[PDB]
């Protein structure tokens, strides 16, 4: 029925955010205030493509 | 030779002995009790109204924190 294509492990690498949930919750309001544009672009890509492989960048 | 001595009531008599029922009234009116109950209920209602409105605001705030963190 076809072969499922997957990204390579190299393309899935990124500088990870290694702070805990408490830090994220404490910063969340200002984080959503400042980093609104890329997050909204990512969500628009996510609900329009309906495919995680198309919104990696 | 001495006087006759016997177990006898004291001269005169004995102090009166109570026997009749004694159940005092000792209570408030019905209106007073009902009014106290209704006032307590109204006070509790107003306090809980304020508290639950504040709780709804707090819940919205942490929901928005979640929304910000989701991406």
B71 contacts on A by Cβ (under 8 Å): 39, 42-43
CB within 8 Å of chain A, chain B residues 46-65: 64-65
Residue indicated by tokens 């209920």: B41
Is A53's Cβ below 8 Å from some Cβ in B? no
Could you give the count of Cα atoms lying within 13 Å of A46 in the half-sphere of its Cβ?
A: 10
Rg (C-alpha) for chain B, rounded Å, is: 37
Give the residue on B whose Cα is nearest the Cα of A31: B68
Q: Cα dihedral sign for A13, A14, A20, A26? A: negative
Token digits for A40?
Answer: 């909204």
Alpha-carbon distance of A46 to A28, in angstroms, equals 21
Q: Do B65 and A25 touch (CB under 8 A)?
A: yes
Q: Rounded CA gap, A33 and B32, in Å? A: 57
Q: Using CA atoms, how far apart are residues A24 and A43, in angstroms rounded to an integer? A: 19
- What is the experimental resolution, given in Å to one decimal place? 2.5
In this structure, are residues B35 and B43 in contact, taking their beta carbons and an 8 Å threshold?
no
CA distance to B14, B18, B66, B71, per residue, from B22 (Å): 22, 10, 70, 79
| 3-state SS assignment for residue B14 | coil
Contacts of A25 in chain B (CB under 8 A): 65, 69
- The residue count of chain A comes to 57
Method: cryo-EM
Helices and strands per DSSP (H, E), number in chain B: 1, 0
Task: Assess contact for A24 and B68: CB atoms under 8 A.
Answer: no
Judge: B69–A29 Cβ closer than 8 Å, yes or no: no
Contacts of A6 (CB under 8 A, 6+ apart): A53
């Amino acid at each position: 029925p076809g072969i499922v294509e997957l990204p390579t492990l190299e393309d899935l690498k990124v500088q990870e955010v290694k702070v805990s949930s408490s830090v994220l919750k404490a910063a969340a309001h200002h984080y959503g205030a400042q980093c609104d544009k890329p997050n909204k672009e990512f969500m628009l890509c996510r609900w329009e493509e309906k495919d995680p492989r198309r919104c990696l960048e | 030779a001495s006087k006759v001595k016997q177990d006898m009531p004291p001269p005169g008599g004995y102090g009166p002995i109570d026997y009749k029922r004694n159940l005092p009234r000792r209570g408030l009116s019905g209106y007073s009790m009902f009014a106290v109950g209704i006032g307590t209920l109204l006070f509790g209602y107003w306090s809980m109204m304020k508290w639950n409105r504040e709780r709804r605001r707090l819940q919205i705030e942490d929901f928005e924190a979640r929304i910000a963190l989701m991406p």
